C-alpha cells in the first residue's frame, strides 16, 4: 500500500516549515517579537466592487508607491508582502535542481524556506564578525547561483551593509546573477536605500513592504523595485490576481501624500523610542552587549539568554529568541514598541541580573 | 554580454502568461466575461488590527467554511483563491522535470499555466464529444502523473462530470495520484459535490472559491477540501501569511449563517435568469446550438462567432471567446448577469442573424 505521504515530493516531506508562529493568545500582553508597529492605524474600505475581479497590478497602488519610492511606475511590482517577492525572484530565475540562491547567515529565514520548498539549492556564505559581507567568500561560491539575497539593514542583527561592498557584490554578479536587496526596514534609514542605483545595475532588485514602518502587516502588501526587464519577467510568473480589492484600496490610501507623512512620523517615533531602549539596555546587569540598530528592533547578547527569554515569556513579554542562529548565541531580538512596553522590558530585565 | 533575459529560466522565457485580461475601461457597459456575480454586495471592515500580522489560517474563516461545506475544520485550507490551491497541489506533489499533471481539454486554463510556470509536465487527455471523461485514454497516460485536475461542473462547457466516472478515475489513481475536483461552480449545483466522498478517497482534494456564487471575487479567497494528510502536506508548502486581515474579516462575515442564506438566494436568482437566457438564445437565428449548463455561464455555438463576438464587443457587450479552445470552434461563453443584461445580449444577437 502507498500512503498519500509517499506521493508527496521528497523535499516537501523533509523540509521544516518556517518558524514564525510563537503565539500565546490572551497570555502575552506585550508583543515585541514580529517587528510590527506597536499601534493600530485605522482604514475603512472605499471601493464596494467586491463582486468584480481586481486589476492584476492596481494602478493607484503602483503609482502611489512609485511616487513615494522615487522610481518609475514601470519599475514597480506589487505582491502579497515581500515574502512573495522572494518567491517570484526564485520562480523566475532559478531552475529547480540546477540553479541556486545565495544568502549570508544570520539573516531573514524566508530566503532559504522558499528555495528549499521550491526545490532550489541554498548556498550560504556567513557574514563576517561584524555581520558585513564576506566578499571574498562570495566570489568563490557564485557558480550556479542565479539569485543573491542580502538584507540591509539586516534582520535580526540590525546594521546596514557597507554600500561600498554592495558595489563589489553587484560587480561580481554582473551578467551572472540577480542581486536582491531586502529593504523591509529601509524606511528607518531611507538615505541608505539602493533604489537610486537601478540605472547603474540591470541585475538589481529591491524588496519593500508595508508591514513594518507603514504599520500594515495585516494587509500582506509588499513591492519589488527593479528595472523594466526584471519586473516584466517577474510579471510572467506571478499569479493573475495577487492583490485583493480591499487591500489595494487601503494600501493606496496609506500611500497618499498624507499617508507618507504619517508613516514618517511613525518612523521618527520608533527611532526616538529605540535610542531610549538602547541606552537603558546597556546599563542592565544581565545585558552583556547591545548592537547598533538602524531598524525597529534591537539585538542584544544576554547572560543566560534562554533563562531570560523564558522568564519574560512567562510574564507576558514576548521577545524573539535568536539563540539558534549562527554566531548569535546568547542573543535575543527585541522589537521596539511604545515607551510603556520598553519600560516593561527594562524593569523585567532588571528583575533578573543573577 | 549577457542580458537579464538570459538569466531567466528557459520555460519562463518561452511561456505565455494566462490570458484573462481583456478590458476596455469605460468602453464596455455589460460585463459577462469573467463569471462574476452581476451585482456588488457590500462589506465593511470590523477588525482594526492592521498593524499586526494575521493568523496563517484564520480560525473564523476555516470554521465558518467547514460548517457550510459540511466537513471537518481540519479538512479545510484557505488560500488566495482557488488559483493558489491549484499551485499548492503541484508545489507539494509534483517534482519539477520528473512528475506531471493531467487535465482534459477544453477546461480551465490555470492548471496548465501553473504547471508550465512551475516547470511540471502537462499531460492532456481531451474529454469526449459530450465533454465527459475519456476514461480509457486517462488509464493509458497516468505514468509519472501525480496530480489530476477535473473541473465539475466544467468551465467553459458548463456540464457536470458523471459521478460514476469520477468513481472510476479515483480508482485508477488510488495510490498513484491526487485527484482534484475543481468545484468553483458547485454552489449552483450543490447536490453534485464530491465533498462527502473524502472518507472513501484518501487522494481526493476539492477546490472551492468565494469568487463566483458568493460574489466576492474581489477578495481573492478560496479553499481546498481534503483529508487531514493532504491538507497538512499542503500547509507545509503554503506562504506563511496567505490571507490578509481585511479579507479574512469580510470572508468570515460572508460565511455566517445569514451570509449563506444570501449566497443561496443569489444562486436561485442566477439559475432562474440562466434558464431564461438559455430559452431565448435557442430561438435566435445566428445561434446554432446552446449547451446545457449547471453554472453561471452558458456556452453556445454561433454562425460566424468571431464576427458576432466582435459586433457585441464594439457595442459594450463583453463576452468570452472560446473559438481557440479544442472542440469549441464557433463557441462563445456568456456569463449570466441581470435580466437587463441578458436582454441586451438577446436583442444585440437578434440584430445579427445574417
Ligand atoms: C517581515 N517578517 C516578519 C517579522 O520578522 P522575523 O520574526 O521573520 O525575523 C514576519 C514574517 C513574515 N513572513 C514570514 N515571517 C520581513 C519580510 C516580509 O515582509 P512581508 O509582511 O511584506 O511578507 C521580508 N524581509 C524581512 C527582512 C523581514 O523581516
Ligand atoms: C475563476 N476564474 C475566473 C473566470 O473564469 P475564466 O474566464 O478564466 O474561464 C477568472 C480567473 C481567475 N484567475 C485566473 N482567471 C475560476 C477559478 C479561480 O477562482 P479564484 O478567483 O478563487 O482564484 C478556479 N477554477 C475555475 C474553473 C474558474 O472558472
Swiss-Prot record, chains A, B:
Entry-linked NCBIfam families: hisC (TIGR01141)
Pathway: Amino-acid biosynthesis; L-histidine biosynthesis; L-histidine from 5-phospho-alpha-D-ribose 1-diphosphate: step 7/9
Cofactor requirements of the protein: pyridoxal 5'-phosphate
Source lineage: Bacteria, Pseudomonadati, Pseudomonadota, Gammaproteobacteria, Enterobacterales
Family: Belongs to the class-II pyridoxal-phosphate-dependent aminotransferase family. Histidinol-phosphate aminotransferase subfamily.
Entry protein name: Histidinol-phosphate aminotransferase
One GO molecular-function entry: histidinol-phosphate transaminase activity
Gene: hisC
GO terms for cellular component: cytosol
Residues found modified as N6-(pyridoxal phosphate)lysine: 212
InterPro entries to which the protein is assigned, alphabetical: Aminotrans_II_pyridoxalP_BS, Aminotransferase_I/II_large, HisP_aminotrans, PyrdxlP-dep_Trfase, PyrdxlP-dep_Trfase_major, PyrdxlP-dep_Trfase_small
Gene3D superfamilies in alphabetical order: Aspartate Aminotransferase, domain 1 (3.90.1150.10), Type I PLP-dependent aspartate aminotransferase-like (Major domain) (3.40.640.10)
